[PDB]
Design a protein around this ligand. Structure first.
Ligand SMILES: NC(=O)C1=CN([C@@H]2O[C@H](COP(=O)(O)OP(=O)(O)OC[C@H]3O[C@@H](n4cnc5c(N)ncnc54)[C@H](OP(=O)(O)O)[C@@H]3O)[C@@H](O)[C@H]2O)C=CC1
Ligand SMILES: CCCCCCCCCCCC(=O)OC[C@H](COP(=O)(O)OCC[N+](C)(C)C)OC(=O)CCCCCCCCCCC
Lengths: 89, 81, 128, 355, 123, 185
């Protein structure tokens, strides 16, 4: 509950106030999903419930596919431009 | 125009070989002012192109034969107009 | 304090033993060219990256989905008895749907490296 | 053709009566006729000196302790020019063997730290006395002895005390001896100056970074020694080789970090603590910053005006800021290119992923 | 086929001094433009102005030649050297053959009159 | 000896804050990816702590083993320029950063309780004082673990989401080929 909210909020702030990278944006998205999954699994343990763990493993799969697609899109952007700069997405 | 001739006239006297230290003017011939010989007129255009952060082609660098032609070439915004 | 825990902590906080032995025992008096890197070789301030073929990155991008497929098969092999003849059919449908994408991957030839400087195969025809 | 830039003539007579007729134009296969003995040839200044001597065929005798530290000297000359002898200052036959056949003897022996077997006295005074008595017994024509700057008989630092006492016993035993007083020598693979400034994780000074000296390039000191070797004008004289411009350690560190484009770390913690830390680190076997060095951190260079200088040798030194680039550029990182804006639209025209 | 390298120029002997004039001036331009590359590739301990001074010196060496074919040969060898320098084929050792002035002073006694050379047996 | 391992959840929370700060702060993004890996390690630890080591190992083999690998794979192959964390560039964010930190954290801790009065909604979130009793029953006769039950429900009670995740993975194959590859004809 605490670790997850903290990771989520700090990842959201490091996404919003990123004037540096695009890799940091990717990282902050992945860490946000991590934080949600940790809150989810703590509640799964406390309630003794499987729906939380099911949703968590589904999030793992979906986040993997998200990463794959995002890093294909970045590769198209780089096909055309050749350099991924500090700004301009 | 006052963007560029400032730095042109600066680099022309940065070039030591000019007998004069202050004969540089627009309408100054690179050659028959006798400030320069033929190699120096490539040295000076080289100094100018890497002053303005550019590189001039070969048919326009031979054509830059006086301080008129220099400023009017840099006038095309190749970079650092 | 179990032997598992002892081993898995001990390996990291001891692994630098020979590192320190080597740092303290061995000479260190560098040169410029001993800090160098090669027989010949150089590169001006041209770029920071080389152009790469698509397959080089596509193998990595496709490792993710196939790895997730094979890892999603773990619940099945740990549930195989309890899901008797129903989950079997379900995971077979799963595997077939995921084999369709593999078929697509093969038929597109996405991991193939293509060659630019082709060998000329066109006839020599002389206008008379 | 090559030339004998070190000699003014080709027929040279020594002060002991030997006639030396130079053979050749001045290359590797040439010979000056001279024989020399450089006692600290393994080291920093000695390597350059032996290189300059053997470039023209001066037969250098190199007394050595470690067989492996000397090997780079054999490349400096042709076959039969560089000759090796195993030596210890606790063996007089060694020193006599080293100085027997020589016309020039150069003592460059000195440690900046004390060891189990050699204190500052045993290396700077007694070793100098042993070499000087060999030089007197064999009537060697020229003896050229290097004593560090700011040498003074009674001084705060034991290094300078012992160096001055050496500079006295040499002059008292061998009156025709030349004493060369170099200032802090900088260069490539230097001992404690620039390589140390550029590699050290943190510099320390008991004083402020405020000791002042005129630093000099090691190659120019070697050149001055080369000129002193063949100039018989220089007997019974003293030389203060110090260099053109004055600097503080803080100024030199500022220069180093401006060249290096990296922020050199310095601490400036007190004397009673750093001196004890140094005194403790002498217990390990490898060289470290000695307590007498942090004593010398309070002793700026006092140049003797009665002593000769570079200009008596027709030499004009370099000074540190023009050579700092050459010397420190190996440690320059060169992080990235400048202002990759204005690269976008030109980069757009190239192919970055090949289909 | 066997294709040429990066900065190759087909050997073409001008039949005119006025064309070889333009060719030589272009080569001078190229050397001057490439001097920063010569300082970056070869770890040079001196100025880019010094490199350009040396280029100008070597171009002045053959300034008052009038035989056309000799000038053609000199242009061809100059372009060979440009291709050898800009493409990192030379090493620092061969590049610094052009720069003996930048290395430290070679000893004390460098004769310029008769008696010096006589005492050193160079007259 | 008993309570030497008591604060191992708090230590993970602290280390997670640290690793997020290092992610935001690292100069080279490769270092940011490595700190993301360290954060995954910390999360996997915490998951072992609360009794879900299966998820810890799944995380190690999926996130660190594939996703972080692909991140490193792309930054090794692509030019990703970076502006360093600066005071002339980022200090303007401090007022909004602090306001948002306070607001978002407090709302995230308030959202989990059903009490009507707003201040009490945070005070219940910080009410982690009393321990849970773990009694033992004898009704579970089988050796069913968390992975077995995940498989059971995912292949029987929730077969549809598995057979939809199949199409999600098909996208994961078919999209990147459409975007990265160029078909001849
Ligand atoms: N470098 C500087 O900044 C300054 C140096 N000097 C003096 O000038 C000379 C230059 O030496 P440096 O250039 O510093 O490089 P080194 O000081 O490394 O040269 C040291 C030489 O002394 C020899 N040596 C030391 N102790 C003994 C010993 N007990 N018995 C025999 N040989 C010994 C070493 O032999 P091995 O290599 O076998 O140990 C080495 O050849 C020294 O006299 C030094 O004191 C003066 C002022 C500044
Ligand atoms: C213990 C290992 C560390 C030794 C050490 O570190 O001891 C090193 C000391 C220091 O010698 P130094 O003359 O002052 O070095 C000179 C240079 N300085 C001033 C920079 C330091 O050796 C002595 O004083 C004499 C002790 C001899 C020890 C020999 C025993 C070796 C056996 C090794 C068994 C494995």
């Amino acid at each position: 509950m605490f670790i997850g909210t903290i990771i989520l909020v700090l990842s959201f702030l490091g996404f919003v106030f990123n004037r540096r990278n695009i890799i940091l944006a990717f990282i902050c998205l992945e860490t946000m999903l991590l934080g949600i999954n940790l809150i989810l699994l703590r509640n799964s343990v406390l309630f003794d419930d499987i729906s939380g763990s099911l949703f968590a493993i589904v999030i793992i799969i979906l986040a993997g596919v998200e990463s794959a697609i995002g890093l294909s899109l970045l590769v198209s952007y780089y096909r055309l431009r050749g350099v991924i700069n500090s700004y301009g997405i | 125009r006052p963007d560029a001739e400032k730095r042109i006239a600066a680099v022309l006297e940065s070039f030591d070989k000019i007998s004069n230290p202050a004969a540089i003017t627009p309408t100054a011939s690179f050659a028959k002012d006798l400030n320069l010989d033929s190699l120096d007129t490539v040295e000076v255009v080289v100094a100018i192109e890497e002053e303005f952060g550019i590189e001039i082609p070969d048919k326009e660098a031979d054509e830059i034969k006086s301080v008129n032609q220099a400023v009017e070439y840099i006038l095309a915004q190749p970079d650092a107009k | 304090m179990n032997t598992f825990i002892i081993f898995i902590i001990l390996i990291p906080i001891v692994g630098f033993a020979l590192l320190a032995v080597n740092i303290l025992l061995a000479v260190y008096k560098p040169y410029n060219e001993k800090l160098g890197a090669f027989e010949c070789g150089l590169t001006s301030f041209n770029q920071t990256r080389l152009a790469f073929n698509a397959a080089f990155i596509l193998v990595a991008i496709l490792f993710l989905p196939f790895d997730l497929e094979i890892s999603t098969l773990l619940p099945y092999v740990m549930s195989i008895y309890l899901v008797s003849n129903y989950g079997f059919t379900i995971v077979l449908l799963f595997l077939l749907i995921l084999i369709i994408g593999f078929v697509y991957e093969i038929n597109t030839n996405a991991l193939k490296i293509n060659k630019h400087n082709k060998p000329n195969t066109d006839s020599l025809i002389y206008k008379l | 053709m090559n030339s004998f830039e070190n000699l003014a003539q080709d027929v040279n007579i020594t002060r002991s009566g030997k006639t030396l007729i130079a053979k050749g134009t001045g290359g590797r296969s040439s010979r000056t006729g001279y024989t020399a003995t450089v006692f600290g040839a393994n080291g920093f200044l000695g390597s350059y000196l032996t290189a300059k001597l053997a470039k023209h065929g001066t037969t250098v005798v190199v007394p050595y302790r470690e067989e492996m530290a000397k090997r780079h000297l054999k490349v400096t000359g042709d076959l039969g020019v560089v000759n090796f002898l195993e030596m210890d200052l606790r063996n007089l036959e060694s020193i006599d063997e080293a100085v027997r056949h020589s016309d020039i003897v150069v003592n460059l022996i000195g440690r900046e730290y004390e060891t189990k077997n050699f204190n500052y006295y045993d290396v700077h005074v007694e070793g100098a006395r042993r070499i000087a008595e060999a030089v007197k017994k064999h009537n060697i024509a020229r003896y050229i002895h290097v004593s560090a700057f700011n040498a003074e008989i009674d001084s705060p630092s034991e290094f300078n005390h012992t160096k001055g006492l050496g500079e006295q016993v040499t002059k008292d035993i061998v009156p025709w001896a030349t004493i060369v007083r170099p200032a802090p020598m900088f260069g490539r693979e230097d001992k404690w100056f620039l390589d140390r400034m550029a590699r050290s994780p943190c510099l320390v000074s008991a004083n402020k970074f405020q000791e002042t000296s005129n630093p000099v390039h090691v190659i120019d000191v070697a050149a001055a020694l080369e000129r002193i070797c063949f100039d018989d004008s220089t007997v019974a004289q003293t030389f203060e080789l110090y260099g053109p411009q004055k600097f503080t350690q803080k100024q030199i560190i500022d220069m180093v970090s401006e060249t290096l484009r990296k922020e050199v770390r310095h601490i400036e913690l007190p004397k009673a603590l750093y001196q004890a830390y140094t005194k403790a680190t002498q217990a390990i076997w490898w060289p470290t910053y000695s307590p007498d060095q942090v004593e010398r951190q309070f002793l700026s260079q006092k140049i003797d005006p009665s002593a000769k200088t570079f200009n008596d040798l027709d030499l004009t030194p370099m000074e540190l800021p023009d050579l700092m680039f050459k010397l420190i550029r190996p440690y320059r990182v060169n992080t990235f290119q400048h202002d990759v804006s204005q690269l976008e639209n030109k980069e757009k025209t190239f192919v970055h992923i090949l289909d | 086929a066997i294709i040429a390298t990066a900065f190759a120029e087909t050997v073409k002997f001008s039949g005119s001094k006025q064309e070889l004039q333009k060719r030589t001036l272009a080569l001078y331009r190229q050397f001057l433009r490439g001097a920063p590359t010569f300082a970056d590739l070869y770890e040079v301990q001196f100025s880019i102005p010094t490199i350009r001074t040396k280029i100008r010196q070597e171009f002045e060496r053959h300034r008052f030649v009038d035989d056309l074919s000799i000038q053609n040969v000199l242009y061809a060898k100059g372009h060979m050297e440009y291709q050898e320098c800009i493409n990192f084929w030379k090493q620092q050792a061969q590049f610094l053959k052009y720069f003996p002035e930048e290395d430290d002073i070679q000893g004390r006694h460098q004769p310029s009159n008769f008696v010096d050379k006589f005492l050193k047996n160079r007259a | 000896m008993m309570y030497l391992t008591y604060y191992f959840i708090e230590i993970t929370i602290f280390l997670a804050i640290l690793c997020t700060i290092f992610i935001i702060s690292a100069k080279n993004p490769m270092v940011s990816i490595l700190y993301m890996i360290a954060l995954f390690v910390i999360a996997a630890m915490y998951l072992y702590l609360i009794g879900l080591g299966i998820f810890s190992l799944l995380y190690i083999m999926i996130y660190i083993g594939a996703i972080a690998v692909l991140f490193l794979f792309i930054i090794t192959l692509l030019d990703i320029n970076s502006t360093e964390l600066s005071v002339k560039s980022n200090i303007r964010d401090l007022p909004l950063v602090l306001i948002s930190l306070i607001v978002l954290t407090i709302s995230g801790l308030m959202i989990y309780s059903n009490d009507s009065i707003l201040i009490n909604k945070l005070l219940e979130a910080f009410g982690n004082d009393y321990n849970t009793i773990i009694t033992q029953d004898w009704f579970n006769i089988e050796n069913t673990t968390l992975l077995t039950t995940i498989g059971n429900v995912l292949l029987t009670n929730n077969a549809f989401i598995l057979l939809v995740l199949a199409i999600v993975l098909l996208l994961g194959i078919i999209g990147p080929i459409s975007i990265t590859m160029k078909h001849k004809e």
